[PDB]
């Protein structure tokens, strides 16, 4: 099933996770036919540890929609934010 979750990540000065995807992007390893932005890796001692996991789909960040966002715009937005970023993610959950 899926779960929508609000996550606060404090930049120090990075978020400590990697992403793939976006409109115009080269995809992702989770939902390959989906244009979304997905968390691909979370630094184990970084600011997102215990909060984000690979597979999490970013659908909003600091109130900006990440639904069907272009890849470069998504990257640049996440990099432009300062201090805390409030994410909305969609996480798949085991049956």
């Amino acid at each position: 099933g899926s779960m929508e979750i609000r996550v606060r990540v404090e930049k120090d000065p990075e978020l400590g996770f990697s992403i793939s995807g976006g409109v115009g992007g080269r995809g992702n390893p989770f939902r390959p036919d989906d244009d979304g932005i997905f968390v691909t890796r979370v630094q184990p001692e970084g600011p997102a540890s215990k909060l984000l996991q690979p597979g999490d789909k970013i659908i909003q960040a600091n109130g900006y929609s990440f639904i069907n966002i272009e890849h470069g715009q998504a990257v640049s937005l996440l990099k432009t934010f300062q201090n805390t970023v409030e994410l909305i993610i969609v996480r798949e959950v085991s049956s």
């Binding site: 990697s18 992403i19 793939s20 995809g27």
Partner: peptide, 9 residues
């Protein structure tokens, strides 16, 4: 196809 290139932020 996706080939594993992700972007750290």
């Amino acid at each position: 196809e996706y080939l594993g290139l992700d972007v750290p932020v």
